[PDB]
Structure 1
Amino acid sequence: VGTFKAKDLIVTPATILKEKPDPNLVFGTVFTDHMLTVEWSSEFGWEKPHIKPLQNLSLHPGSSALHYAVELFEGLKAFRGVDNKIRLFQPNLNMDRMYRSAVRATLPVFDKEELLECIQQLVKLDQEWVPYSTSASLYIRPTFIGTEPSLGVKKPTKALLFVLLSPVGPYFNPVSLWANPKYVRAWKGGTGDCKMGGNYGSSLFAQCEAVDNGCQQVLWLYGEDHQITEVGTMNLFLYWINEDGEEELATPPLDGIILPGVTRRCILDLAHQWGEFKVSERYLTMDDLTTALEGNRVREMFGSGTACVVCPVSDILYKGETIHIPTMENGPKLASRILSKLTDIQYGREERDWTIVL
């Protein structure tokens, strides 16, 4: 057990540099000039990290990442502030999650501080890619795959940790959800609370069926009571008047089937800080939703995540019936306020312990 170290970084600058794209971009379509890569073996442990020109990965055909999904990823952003200072948002939480995911994937552990510094060195080198727009940013995709060259299903004796950079804009423009309870995203005892690739490949069929019915995303339902868990790849928030006639900002609890998002945490922290209404991490079902609608109790519904931050939901297609959510007709007040707060913090218009600057 050990870790690679940032002070050991081997930088190899690309001679040919690619022209930056126009800030006004399709998510994950464009990649920067460089990338970070770190090899690992159970025999020699972590090798020295490298920052080199973006290039293809040369992988053995038997690599466990291609056969048994031994893999995991992360997603954070770097923002060019109104002061032109590049900032990262709550990077330390992504490193924690990534570490936890590694352990649950049986991939080799590493030192969070070192990885973060290596990332900071990667972004710094390609800092000119960080968009020159207050509505765009640079997406950081840390990835960790098993490269064991054997078909035996088991803990990998070889692995590759790498990091890609992609300048992006959007991932309000409300979305419509497709809710089919026949499809299940995560289960108790599963890995839904980790960012392991295995939990995503199996959702593509559902996502396709969603676009097949005019929806932009999938509303993941769970259990006999059809609990509302997540919106596609985002955590779900419901701003309504609860059963007790109280103004409430609710979101499903972290009971195993919900991925603990960094945006989810922040929203809950801002929501608690303001102390203007009740904040509850509890169970929400379709019936709770419908009963509330046929009472004008609902105010806003939206998804949260690094890619969208705040993503208003306006309709849910459930049991052949299109269920409209008055999110947009009520502002969206909270959703907008939350967007401004996070955006202000991310672009340096507001000082806070949530961002770091190199």
Structure 2
Amino acid sequence: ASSSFKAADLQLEMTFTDHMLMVEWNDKGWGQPRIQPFQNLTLHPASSSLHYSLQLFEGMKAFKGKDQQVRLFRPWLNMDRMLRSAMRLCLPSFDKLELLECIRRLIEVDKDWVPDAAGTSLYVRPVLIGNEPSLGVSQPRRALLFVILCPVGAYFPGGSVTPVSLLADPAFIRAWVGGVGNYKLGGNYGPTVLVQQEALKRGCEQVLWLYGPDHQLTEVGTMNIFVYWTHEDGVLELVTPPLNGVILPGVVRQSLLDMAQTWGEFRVVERTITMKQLLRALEEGRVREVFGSGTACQVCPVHRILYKDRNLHIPTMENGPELILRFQKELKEIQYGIRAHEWMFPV
């Protein structure tokens, strides 16, 4: 009472998994967390979740190693992000480690659902919605937190790393400074459906999100973007856009920056990336690799960019892709328990 829900108070009642977590918030505080069979949600028609998008989510993977032990990849970063998203849309705060322990217990009940094939895992989807039975745009004192799980079977059609189809049109904007693009809110995704369809009929599989008067490369679909090149100063570097408001702080993004910094072989920085710099670098043969990063596709190569209906080839595949494969191998090693690391949380 008077604070957050506790995993020690959990209520147990024994393509998605068999069970789900559910926690309710109402004025005075949180109710106890419930692990119950997968079932439909019953919401009032005036629920603020459906009218004013008082909704946020998270996305992380649970990996089954060779020793058959299930582990979550840096879940503390997902919990940090979830709480920041909650504060912004201006829902109840909760204790990050209590939600983690509740999710741990949920994955434990559905442990048989975690796949062990190469490139497979269990997708954990936590959600927090406003559940106020009112049409007023306000702080929603009733709320609902739920977690659902689902097995995912390899991103790539086989085991071969395949490059993806980008469209770069300045008329479409995902996020803005002073906006809400740095939080995983449902509201940022709905508007992308029409843009993705526009990309598909223009011969592209995904969208390269441009921002500002100087056409800054921000995100690749629902992934962060990275460019491995020799910059205009002659130094070999790995660059990704900074957290200035328009970028979603990805867990894989942070991990790639952390790993590359530890190696100390090349410069690793956060510095926006304009189409002017990319066009110049391509023409000068300074670009090595360009990729997207995210939970779905850990490291995802890009081979051409349709900018103002262009056919700009990105030489990612003819440069190995050396860094992508190194990142993929080291991540697989950490995630599937082949090497012990502080980044993994055992379930």
Normalized against structure 2, the TM-score is what?
0.97
Deviations 1:78-131, CA, capped at 9 Å, x for gaps: 000011111111011111110111001100000111100000000000011000
Amino acid in structure 2 at the alignment position of 1:80: K
User: Match of 1:245, SS?
Assistant: coil
The question of whether the paired residues in 1 share the 8 Å contact of 2:167 and 2:306 is answered with yes
Separation in 1, partners of 2:116, 2:221: 29
Separation in 1, partners of 2:66, 2:141: 46
- Say which of 66, 70, 73 aligns to 1:82: 66
1:234 aligns with 2:234: no
- Say which of 256, 262, 274 aligns to 2:263: 274
The question of whether the paired residues in 1 share the 8 Å contact of 2:227 and 2:240 is answered with yes
Amino acid in structure 2 at the alignment position of 1:98: M
Counterpart of 2:158? none
1:185 aligns with 2:169: no
User: Match of 2:311, SS?
Assistant: strand
The question of whether the paired residues in 1 share the 8 Å contact of 2:65 and 2:116 is answered with no
> Identity across aligned pairs (percent)?
60
335-344 vs 170-179, which deviates more?
170-179
Amino acid in structure 1 at the alignment position of 2:7: A
1:52 aligns with 2:36: yes
Separation in 1, partners of 2:309, 2:78: 39
- Say which of 276, 279, 295 aligns to 2:284: 295
Deviations 1:288-324, CA, capped at 9 Å, x for gaps: 1110000111000000001111010111111121111
Counterpart of 1:224? 213
- Alpha-carbon offset, residue 246 of structure 1: 1.2
Separation in 1, partners of 2:244, 2:228: 20
- Say which of 79, 85, 100 aligns to 1:116: 100
Counterpart of 1:147? 131
Runs of 4+ displaced beyond 3 Å:
none
Separation in 1, partners of 2:129, 2:311: 41
Separation in 2, partners of 1:149, 1:311: 42
Separation in 2, partners of 1:290, 1:342: 31
Separation in 1, partners of 2:241, 2:12: 44
User: Match of 2:306, SS?
Assistant: strand
1:348 aligns with 2:332: no
- Alpha-carbon offset, residue 59 of structure 1: 0.6
Unaligned residue ranges in structure 1 (runs of 5+): 14-29
- Alpha-carbon offset, residue 333 of structure 1: 0.3
- Alpha-carbon offset, residue 133 of structure 1: 1.0
Normalized against structure 1, the TM-score is what?
0.94
- Say which of 222, 227, 234 aligns to 1:245: 234
Separation in 1, partners of 2:61, 2:116: 14
Counterpart of 2:11? 10
**How many residue pairs are counted as aligned between the two chains?**
341
Separation in 2, partners of 1:208, 1:64: 28
Separation in 2, partners of 1:241, 1:257: 25
Separation in 1, partners of 2:70, 2:154: 19
The question of whether the paired residues in 1 share the 8 Å contact of 2:118 and 2:154 is answered with no
